[PDB]
Curated annotation (Swiss-Prot), chain A:
The MPN (JAB/Mov34) domain mediates interaction with TSSC4 and SNRNP200. Has structural similarity with deubiquitinating enzymes, but lacks the residues that would bind the catalytic metal ion. Contains a region with structural similarity to reverse transcriptase, presenting the classical thumb, fingers and palm architecture, but lacks enzyme activity, since the essential metal-binding residues are not conserved. Signal peptide: none annotated. It comes from Homo sapiens (Human). The chain holds residues 585 to 633 of 2335 of the full protein. Plays a role in pre-mRNA splicing as core component of precatalytic, catalytic and postcatalytic spliceosomal complexes, both of the predominant U2-type spliceosome and the minor U12-type spliceosome. Functions as a scaffold that mediates the ordered assembly of spliceosomal proteins and snRNAs. Required for the assembly of the U4/U6-U5 tri-snRNP complex, a building block of the spliceosome. Functions as a scaffold that positions spliceosomal U2, U5 and U6 snRNAs at splice sites on pre-mRNA substrates, so that splicing can occur. Interacts with both the 5' and the 3' splice site. Widely expressed. It is found in: Nucleus; Nucleus speckle. This is Pre-mRNA-processing-splicing factor 8.
Curated annotation (Swiss-Prot), chain B:
Involved in pre-mRNA splicing and its phosphorylated form (by SRPK2) is required for spliceosomal B complex formation. Independently of its spliceosome formation function, required for the suppression of incorrect R-loops formed during transcription; R-loops are composed of a DNA:RNA hybrid and the associated non-template single-stranded DNA. It comes from the Eukaryota. It is found in: Nucleus; Chromosome. The gene is DDX23. The chain holds residues 241 to 352 of 820 of the full protein. The lineage of its organism: Eukaryota, Metazoa, Chordata, Craniata, Vertebrata. Belongs to the DEAD box helicase family. DDX23/PRP28 subfamily. Disulfide bonds: none annotated. It comes from Homo sapiens (Human). This is Probable ATP-dependent RNA helicase DDX23.
UniProtKB/Swiss-Prot annotation, chain C:
GO terms for biological process: 7-methylguanosine cap hypermethylation; mRNA splicing, via spliceosome; protein methylation; RNA splicing; spliceosomal snRNP assembly; U2-type prespliceosome assembly. Methylated on arginine residues by PRMT5 and PRMT7; probable asymmetric dimethylation which is required for assembly and biogenesis of snRNPs. This is Small nuclear ribonucleoprotein Sm D3. It is found in: Cytoplasm, Cytosol; Nucleus. The chain holds residues 3 to 79 of 126 of the full protein. Belongs to the snRNP core protein family.
From Swiss-Prot, chain D:
It is found in: Nucleus. PROSITE patterns: G_TR_2. The gene is EFTUD2. It comes from the Eukaryota. This is 116 kDa U5 small nuclear ribonucleoprotein component. One of its GO terms (molecular function) is GTPase activity. GO terms for biological process: cellular response to xenobiotic stimulus; mRNA splicing, via spliceosome; response to cocaine. The lineage of its organism: Eukaryota, Metazoa, Chordata, Craniata, Vertebrata. Belongs to the TRAFAC class translation factor GTPase superfamily. Classic translation factor GTPase family. EF-G/EF-2 subfamily.
Length: 49, 98, 77, 836, 341
């Protein structure tokens, strides 16, 4: 959301949510890109964030 | 290097910028001792697997210790169904592979 | 399970008296209170109708000659 | 309600029990089930275990019982006879062995608890020994039967195999501890009960026979209660129980008529709950409504098993006919408990438990109030009757007939019999029962013989509370601000009162020291000391271990000691004892109350000691059970026996205290033999007084000890761990890091869990209970208890050893590092000198 | 969805991510009537269900609000307090195995409970896998406690260092000033559960994962036992309680394995939650650690746990209200209309 929309420039606290979502990504990705999956833009587990 | 690290830890105890990526200085998993640096992952009787990680990747990655334990204890009279179910699995996911 | 048989089973082991049909009154601790009225006591004082009273180390009266029994009513209240 | 008091008056329909068992074996849940059976308004939550007897908050948060809780409850029997039950559900943690003993002195029955999936564990191995040593009837209740079905999913035959393996292992293990041969436990005999506390299942073979009799009818439940457990079977065609197999695929009677129906009913209430559940409840007479069928699986299982089995009659009739009543069990309890035994007038007065006889009730617990100010004592009225407001006499633990100063006349404020959370006020408590006496806290520490004033002239006290373990770990305690030090003195006194083996002590350096059994024990006692009694701030030193001082070889010279008058002269030699002799003293195998002939034969046969000295052995170390020994070995021609017999007492007095302190540092002296080679006593009783002999005695003892090559003995904890086979190496790696070594690694039969028994130094075992679970991610778990003492590696008296400030030293330096810091902790001199 | 999105990421060698903004940026959004209404929507992401196993959920699994019409399973259109049969719940649990750790007990959460994290926060200490927090009280002077005769080094024996988790497990023994500290030692008896893997097997089977009992008869440890035809006889009527019913049905292994399922899947019935209030990966960062994962996701784990613990600690009971719904007042107002769209 931060990259696509510059809303963090109008309320700083949003960084928390921003960082929160990114952290969630990392959590899901490392669990998603496991075994023969590889790395790429193939994850759509959006309900986490 | 564990000794010097643990002695140093004993001495420690007894004596604007919109950045989104976190810092590596908030990491806490750093450990000066092996028993917590390398924790024994729960094999969970071999029949339990971590949620996010894929199943068969864990199966082949598993320590196989319970595999050889079962190989030791299992008798011939009840190995036929084990082999049959294993081959039937290999066939039915081979269906997906092909 | 009846109310009188349940009171005889729950009244066993405490100090109570039992008078038979022949006038023999045995007072003591009911060691065994069977469902057929068989009362077995140990070291009970047995007094006959003539007035002679003695002590029995182990007595057992059958349920056919059971007249009445007076026990402590503290368990009912 | 008044029927409670009416039954209270009687002394033959009363049982005193302890549901002693291993850690987390369902004892508290068992008492909770009994409460749910008695009180209707008390209903356990659907998921969270109610834990009724866990009344203090710290055990409500840590999840482990810490202190025994009295439960006074009226239980119907199998035949429906009410019995008054005094229940002392002791904490299961082995570090909390204090309360097991504290509740075992005031009880006549032992109801063991064993997890069906865990088998015999470390704790139970000591409780069977302890209960046998305290002369109580022992009964086993295998709890958590559900684990064999809902978790292990064992075949019913294998479930019976597991049950019999854990039943006979108890019988096999107890045969070492029990001298008598009437102590064989078996469910057919009625010693063994089977229960699942969570699902309220409970039965003895008699009770289950009663259920079948209830259903079919015209069945004698006693004869059918027999012929159930064993290798016999059932023939469906001849309707007779046979030792031999009636069919090829036969099945034992117990499994066929008890375990299999349990399997089927709980499988029907956990599987096909929607299709075949009404069918299997119609076949069993269990009628349920719609709304009580919409619950989850666990509450439904508990409700259905409550409906099917019914009340907890199996436990009641198991207990009634297999533990003696107080009127029957008083004689062994007195002959093992009262100092004078049954022989004395008061001793004979106890064999009958007369409600109107002399009152010398015995209190062995301190249950504080909610404000922590006053302490309500808890005890058993072994005989006599007590009343509110009665002027009573409280004795002590050092009170004797000669020392009449260790007592106080007090006023019993109120009286109430307590069942966990709520207490029932009673004006009179008869004999053979339990009671919380109030207003007697002031003159008591731990146990007390509260007796009649000016009515029991020659009455003695009860024996001191002997434990199974030993207080090993030692922690220093100070206030943060010394300006409130007295606030902490009373708190330390309070925690000393509310913990039977707690040992507060002030040392020369103005240091307050608390002695405990384990890490969790000290955690609990200091939480009590901080948030409960003192409500102030307290600094704690990191835990340290008490040490012992010993010898390995005789001294190079016969070092002696003389009084300042240079008239008396005592020469003594310190040498080690035979391997295993020290254990044969602490176990009360031999005493000082023995006659000379028996001890002489004992040492002539078992320890081949010469009779010239076997009849010349005065004392046994410090106190009475001390592992050290004093030996008279002077030839009669040089030392006059008549002159010797005067200082024969004072030398022991300076020795029983000489070995207690220790020359190296203020630690116990253990496994040392003292031979006297020369005595020059004053020919007149004027200058040979105690004030001259006793310092000379301690000086000669210290000189002999120092001249003999001294060593330190550290106490090793015996640690058992239970882990799945994938974590056994994860236990070896941890135990190798703390100087430990593994003795055995035995898989538990009928379960994938293992049992690794090892030894670990107590000073090296701090955090190991957490160093293991975290390393194995919580799968493994450890329990620790003191086992023995071992010579610390290295020589404690070498001056070439340098002690660095803040890093561990190797093994050879340990014996030097341990004492010196200990000496520095004791405030003593840096090193040891021959003058001491 | 998790089990399949991992397959098309493995099937599609490259991924054609949708363009953004998909709709022409700065361009009036397309009218719904002319374009969207007529075009047939493409197939949605869906797993083909096996009728041999997933049959209990085959009829309605991918509906908008499953079992909304079925009065047997749900209360009604309000869609609360669903009731699910055991085959249904077991099928759902088997299908959700990719989003569920197979943890039966909580002993794996020894020092990663939220109570232990409250302790670590109140002590200004961090579990190696746990988050870091600002001190509850600065107490810098109390940190700078002087070298007394109590805490003197030369009086202290150091064998193994007092690690942070030691001071967390026993926060009244190894440390000083334990204010606002919580306790947890819930070593629940580690449940010994062996989930079945054979589709065909007796539900109560003695699988080799159990060490054999090894029954013995070496010593004649006899007990009171009868002989044949010895003063006893059984009535013809009396039998074991359950003879007709089988020892184990087909739904016995599934039911037993459903006891030790995670929190959502051990309920026969329960209330309905919102789509917002279901954290699917909540039990992922609550796990002990990531098994050998890089730093940029380890720190992610600590930063997720930090916010989780902060929310748990700062939680307050909701304030009593009067239940004034907003859209209901709109429906009451003459200025608004309702419509399915």
């Amino acid at each position: 959301v931060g990259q696509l929309t510059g809303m963090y420039r109008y309320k700083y606290k949003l960084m928390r949510q921003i960082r929160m979502c990114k952290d969630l990504k990392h959590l899901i990705y490392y669990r998603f890109n496991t075994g023969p999956v590889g790395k790429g833009p193939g994850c759509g587990f959006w309900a986490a964030g | 290097k564990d000794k010097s690290k643990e002695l140093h830890a004993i001495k420690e105890r007894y004596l604007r910028k919109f950045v989104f990526e976190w810092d590596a200085s908030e990491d806490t998993s750093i450990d000066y001792n092996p028993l917590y640096k390398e924790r024994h992952q729960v094999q969970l009787l071999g029949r339990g697997f971590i949620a996010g990680i894929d199943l068969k990747q864990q199966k082949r990655e598993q320590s196989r210790f319970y595999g050889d334990l079962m190989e030791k204890r299992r008798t011939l009279e009840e190995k036929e169904q084990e082999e049959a179910r294993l081959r039937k699995l290999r066939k039915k996911e081979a269906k997906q592979r092909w | 399970i009846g109310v009188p048989i349940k009171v005889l089973h729950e009244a066993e082991g405490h100090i109570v008296t039992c008078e038979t049909n022949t006038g023999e009154v045995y007072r003591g601790k009911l060691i065994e209170a069977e469902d057929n009225m068989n009362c077995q006591m140990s070291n009970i004082t047995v007094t006959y109708r003539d007035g002679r009273v003695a002590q029995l180390e182990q007595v057992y009266i059958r349920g056919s000659k059971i007249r009445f029994l007076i026990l402590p009513d503290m368990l009912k209240n | 309600m008044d029927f409670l008091a009416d039954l209270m008056d009687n002394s033959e329909l009363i049982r005193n029990v302890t549901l002693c068992g291993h850690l987390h074996h369902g004892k508290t849940c068992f008492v909770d089930c009994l409460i749910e059976q008695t009180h209707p308004e008390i209903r356990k939550r659907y998921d969270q275990d109610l834990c009724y007897t866990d009344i203090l908050f710290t055990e409500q948060e840590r999840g482990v019982g810490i202190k025994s809780t009295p439960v006074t409850v009226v239980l119907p029997d199998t035949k429906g006879k009410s019995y008054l039950f005094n229940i002392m559900d002791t904490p299961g943690h082995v570090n909390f062995s204090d309360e097991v003993t504290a509740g075992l002195r005031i009880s006549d029955g032992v109801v063991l608890f064993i997890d069906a999936a865990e088998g015999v564990m470390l704790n139970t191995e000591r409780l069977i020994k302890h209960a046998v040593q305290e002369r109580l009837a022992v009964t086993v209740c295998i709890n958590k039967i559900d684990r064999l079905i809902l978790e292990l999913k064992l075949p019913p035959t294998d479930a019976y195999y597991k049950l019999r393996h854990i039943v006979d292992e108890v019988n096999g293990l107890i045969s070492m501890y029990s001298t008598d041969e009437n102590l064989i436990l078996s469910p057919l005999l009625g010693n063994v009960c089977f229960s699942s506390s969570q699902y309220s299942i409970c039965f003895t073979l008699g009770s289950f026979a009663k259920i079948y009799a209830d259903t079919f009818g015209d069945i004698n439940y006693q004869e059918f209660a027999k012929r159930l457990w064993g290798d016999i079977y059932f023939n469906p065609k001849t309707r007779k129980f046979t030792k031999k197999a009636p069919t090829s695929s036969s099945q034992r009677s117990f499994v066929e008529f008890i375990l299999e129906p349990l399997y089927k009913i709980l499988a029907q209430v956990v599987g096909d709950v929607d299709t075949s559940l009404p069918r299997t409840l119609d076949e069993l007479g269990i009628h349920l409504t719609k709304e009580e069928l919409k619950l989850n699986i666990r509450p439904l299982l508990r409700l259905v098993c409550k409906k099917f089995f019914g009340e907890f009659t199996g436990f009641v009739d198991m207990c009634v006919q297999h533990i003696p009543s107080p009127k029957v069990g008083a004689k062994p309890k007195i002959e093992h408990t009262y100092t004078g035994g049954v022989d004395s007038d008061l001793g004979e007065a106890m064999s009958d438990c007369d409600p109107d006889g002399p009152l010398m009730c015995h209190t062995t617990k301190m249950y504080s109030t909610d404000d922590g100010v006053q302490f309500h004592a808890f005890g058993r009225v072994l005989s006599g009757t007590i009343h509110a407001g009665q002027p009573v006499k409280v004795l002590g633990e050092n009170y004797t007939l000669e020392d009449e100063e260790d007592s106080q006349i007090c006023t019993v404020g109120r009286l109430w019999i307590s069942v966990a959370r709520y207490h029932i006020e009673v004006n009179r408590v008869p004999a053979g029962n339990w009671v919380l006496i109030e207003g007697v806290d002031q003159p008591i520490v731990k146990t007390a013989t509260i007796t009649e004033p000016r009515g029991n002239e020659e009455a003695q006290i009860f024996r001191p509370l002997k434990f199974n373990t030993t207080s090993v770990i030692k922690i220093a305690v100070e206030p943060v601000n010394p300006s409130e030090l007295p606030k902490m003195l009373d708190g330390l006194r309070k925690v000393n009162k509310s913990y039977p083996s707690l040992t507060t002590k002030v040392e020369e350096s103005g240091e307050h020291v608390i002695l405990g059994t384990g890490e969790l024990y000290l955690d609990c006692v200091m939480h009590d000391l901080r948030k409960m009694y003192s409500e102030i701030d307290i600094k704690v030193a990191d835990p340290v271990v008490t040490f012992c001082e010993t010898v390995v070889e005789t001294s190079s010279l016969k070092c002696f000691a003389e009084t300042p008058n240079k008239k008396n002269k005592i020469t003594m030699i310190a040498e080690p004892l035979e391997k295993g002799l020290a254990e044969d003293i602490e176990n009360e195998v031999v005493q000082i109350t023995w006659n000379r002939k028996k001890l002489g034969e004992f040492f002539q046969t078992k320890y081949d000691w010469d009779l010239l000295a076997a009849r010349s052995i005065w004392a046994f170390g410090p106190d009475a059970t001390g592992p050290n020994i004093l030996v008279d070995d002077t030839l009669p021609s040089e030392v006059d026996k008549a002159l010797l017999g005067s200082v024969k007492d004072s030398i022991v007095q300076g020795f029983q205290w000489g070995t207690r302190e220790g020359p190296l540092c203020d630690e116990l002296i253990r496994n040392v033999k003292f031979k006297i080679l020369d005595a020059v006593v004053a020919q007149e009783p004027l200058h040979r007084g105690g004030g001259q002999i006793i310092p000379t005695a301690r000086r000669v003892v210290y000189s002999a000890f120092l001249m003999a090559t001294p060593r330190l003995m550290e106490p090793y904890y015996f640690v058992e761990v239970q882990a799945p086979a994938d974590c056994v190496s994860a236990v070896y790696t941890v135990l190798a890091r703390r100087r430990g070594h593994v003795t055995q690694d035995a898989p538990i039969p009928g379960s994938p869990l293992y049992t690794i028994k090892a030894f670990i130094p107590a000073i090296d075992s701090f955090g190991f209970e957490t160093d293991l679970r975290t390393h194995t991610q919580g799968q493994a778990f450890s329990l620790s208890v003191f086992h023995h003492w071992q010579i610390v590696p290295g020589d404690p008296l070498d001056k070439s050893i340098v002690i660095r400030p803040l890093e561990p030293q190797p093994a050879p330096h340990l014996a030097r590092e341990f004492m010196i810091k200990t000496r520095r902790r004791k405030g003593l001199s840096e090193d040891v000198s021959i003058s001491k | 969805m998790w089990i399949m999105m991992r397959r098309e990421k493995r099937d599609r060698r490259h991924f054609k991510r949708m363009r953004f903004p998909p709709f022409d940026d700065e361009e009036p959004p397309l009218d719904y009537a002319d374009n969207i209404l007529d075009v047939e929507p493409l197939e949605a992401i869906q797993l083909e269900l096996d009728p041999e196993e997933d049959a209990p959920v085959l009829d309605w699994f991918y509906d908008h609000q499953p079992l909304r019409d079925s009065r047997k399973y749900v209360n009604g259109s309000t869609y609360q307090r669903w009731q699910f049969t055991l085959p249904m719940m077991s099928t759902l649990y088997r299908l959700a195995n990719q989003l569920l750790t197979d943890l039966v007990d909580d002993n794996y959460f020894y020092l990663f409970d939220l109570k232990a994290f409250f302790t670590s926060k109140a002590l200004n200490m961090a579990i190696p896998g746990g988050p870091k927090f600002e001190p509850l009280v600065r107490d810098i002077n109390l940190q700078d406690e002087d070298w007394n005769e109590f805490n003197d080094i030369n009086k202290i024996i150091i064998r193994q260092p007092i690690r942070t988790e030691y001071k967390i497990a026993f926060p009244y023994l190894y440390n000083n000033l334990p204010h606002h500290v919580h306790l947890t030692w819930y070593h629940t008896p580690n449940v010994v559960f062996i989930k079945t893997e054979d589709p065909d097997l007796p539900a109560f089977y003695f699988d080799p994962l159990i060490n054999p009992i090894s029954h013995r008869h070496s010593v004649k440890s006899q007990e009171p036992l009868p002989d044949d035809d010895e003063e006893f006889e059984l009535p013809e009527f009396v039998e074991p309680f359950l003879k007709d019913t089988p020892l184990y049905t087909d739904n016995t292994a599934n039911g037993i394995a459903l006891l030790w399922a995670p929190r959502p899947f051990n309920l026969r019935s329960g209330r309905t939650r919102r789509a917002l209030d279901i954290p699917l990966v909540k039990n992922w960062y609550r796990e002990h650690c990531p098994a050998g994962q890089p730093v940029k996701v380890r720190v992610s784990y600590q930063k997720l746990l930090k916010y989780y613990v902060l929310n748990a600690l700062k939680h307050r009971p909701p304030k009593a209200q009067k239940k004034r719904y907003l859209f209901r007042s709109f429906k009451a107002t003459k200025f608004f209309q309702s419509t399915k769209l």
